[PDB]
């Protein structure tokens, strides 16, 4: 559970209050957070950002292609690195628990292999799983495979189309946040994720930018230009990222050793250093966590008006004598929490 | 530039010489900023292209090589000889900036040039733009359509050599210079994939698959190159240099080694020299059966025989000179 992102703590503990709040006024929860999309080429790092995110590795990562099939990550708080209080169950496995998220990787691969073979094939047909822990938030995360545009195995003449209808699926709902996930050693006039996310959402305002790779840019270059706004704007910005490489996945690299070493490489390259707080995964889960609170706090001005209402209502309205003061001494609660 | 071992190879140049006594063109095709215009100037060998990254070329330039024995032209500037290619360079760029402005605009106008040369062959190059995704400054939504449609018509011709140019440090399920090649040319007959930024892939990574053949085919195999980066690009290094430094890489790369007569510009001139001789040698069984033919009619009308005495000559001068033609073939 990684602070100051979206498995905040004090986050999780502002939607646990606010919904006891609303579940004790009988006031239906407006409460509605978007999934998070990763969007972008084959192999552009899609996978490495998702767990990145979650703070634990459980998605199978590697060069050509890997993820084949949807990954729909269902996220789940549950009142109380193996640990027992927390863990992942798929729902084509009902009834067990994955307390090792090294075994959920393994998982995913086996059921993803046991679908579309073990040459490149493809399916839309969505992997569900579900992570229990007291330290995350009732958030959708989803992983997809990269677009590509020459076929290779198994793969249809209209692949691009094929994974093109799949991502819009995910990404065409108004609800949903767009990682474009675009690698920095490629131009960004041809990022796939940024095309596909301006054809869903021209307007910018549900796309964040990640620049992955930048640690294998040829020598002196940088993304500064981008970042800055100067090529392809974003409202929502970029975010650069430094990931695993395809030797550190080989080796078996613990995410906690390669977020340290991407907070070195932001920290010592000189076009980097001057801005290193907006650099990394950690501004990425910032702007994400932003963006959650942005999506809660919207909720507070309809809540009080019917707050208000209700209180109005029940004033003039006044064992019913008792239940009817306990909720108007918590209806006052409620608006007193609301306004904090 | 008199390079031998590739397209300007001075024996090949006396062979052309010799038989008059129609080349296919060369186009890259590939992603933006994926370094065409690097593969193309490194098979020409002298600098004169604009690179850089970003959006540098944005309009097609059409270079001409014509032989001839004792400098450049453009169409839009006739008169003038440019016997520095940097000023050829610079030209390039201020004649695509004159028509596109200087906000990533795009022609397919092209930029006709033509370089004069004893060491060069009547041959037609082009470099083109790279094919983009998303539009930059004044660039319209259709900028791919376009973009597509421009290489199109140079692509889709039978007598075009595609340099399906493809960064190695990117998937190469993901090119789009295969992609298009593959959509003029499925069969593969004319198409050569080329890989660069082969030093720039991550550690543990390698084309080895590719060129074995293991991931997208291609009838005329892959070659490996490692043109000059953007820290080159700005130091303004020479094309020695970096030649060598392209030969050292692959001398020196555990994975390329044991075969390192297989990569880098030098095979692929010499993969274009073995397809413009396959195309030369190709156009000798109808003029063998042309010299043939006229060889009977002469020594018919020569066994026949004032009109007589210099029809006589004309056709004793007329045998002698299509044996030599004949003798000249073998
Ligand atoms: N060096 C480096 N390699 C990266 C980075 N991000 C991704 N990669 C590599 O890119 C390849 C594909 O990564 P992955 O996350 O599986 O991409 P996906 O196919 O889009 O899900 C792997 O070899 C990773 O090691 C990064 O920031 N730096
Ligand atoms: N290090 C390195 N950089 C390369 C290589 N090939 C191209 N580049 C860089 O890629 C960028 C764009 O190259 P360019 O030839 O202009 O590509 P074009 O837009 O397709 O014509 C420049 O910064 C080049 O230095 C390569 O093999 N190695
Ligand atoms: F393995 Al991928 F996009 F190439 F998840
Ligand atoms: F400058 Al380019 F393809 F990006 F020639
Ligand atoms: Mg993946
Ligand atoms: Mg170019
Ligand atoms: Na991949
Ligand atoms: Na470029």
């Known amino acids: 559970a990684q602070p100051g992102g979206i498995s905040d703590p004090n986050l999780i503990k502002l939607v646990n209050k606010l919904q006891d709040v609303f579940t004790t006024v009988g006031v239906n929860n407006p409460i509605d957070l978007p999934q998070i999309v990763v969007v972008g080429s084959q192999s552009s790092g899609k996978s490495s950002v998702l767990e990145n995110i979650v703070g634990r590795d459980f998605l199978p990562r590697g060069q050509g292609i890997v993820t084949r099939r949807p990954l729909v990550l269902q996220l789940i708080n549950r009142q109380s ?3 027992l209080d927390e863990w992942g169950e798929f729902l084509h496995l009902p009834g067990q628990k994955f307390y090792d998220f090294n075994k959920i990787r393994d998982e995913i ?4 292999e046991a679908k579309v073979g073990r040459n490149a094939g493809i399916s839309p047909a ?3 799983l579900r992570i229990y822990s007291p330290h995350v938030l009732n958030l959708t995360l989803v992983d997809l495979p990269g677009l590509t545009r020459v076929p290779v195995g198994d793969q249809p003449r209209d692949i691009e189309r094929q994974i093109r209808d799949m991502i819009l699926k995910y990404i065409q709902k108004p609800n949903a946040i767009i990682l474009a996930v675009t690698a920095a050693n490629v131009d960004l006039a041809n990022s796939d994720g940024l095309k596909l996310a301006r054809e869903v959402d021209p307007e910018g305002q549900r796309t964040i930018g990640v620049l ?3 640690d294998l840019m040829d020598e ?3 993304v500064v230009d981008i970042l800055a706004g100067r090529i392809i704007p974003l409202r929502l910005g970029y ?4 990931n695993r490489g395809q030797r550190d996945i080989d080796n078996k690299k613990p995410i906690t050793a390669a977020l340290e070493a991407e907070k070195a490489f932001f920290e010592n390259h000189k076009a980097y250093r001057n801005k290193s707080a907006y650099c990394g995964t ?5 702007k994400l966590n932003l963006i959650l609170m942005m999506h809660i706090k919207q909720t507070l001005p309809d809540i009080k008006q019917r707050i208000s209402s209700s209180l109005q209502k029940y004033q003039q ?3 019913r004598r008792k239940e009817c003061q306990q909720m108007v001494e918590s209806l006052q609660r409620a608006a007193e929490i609301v306004s904090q």
Do not use: S
């Open 81 to 83: 690195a193996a640990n």
């Open 109 to 112: 691969n086996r059921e993803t």
């Open 126 to 128: 969505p992997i569900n």
């Open 212 to 214: 992955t790779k930048v």
């Open 220 to 222: 002196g270059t940088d």
């Open 239 to 242: 975010v650069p990222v430094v």
């Open 282 to 286: 950690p501004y990425l889960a910032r």
């Open 317 to 319: 309205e006044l064992r």
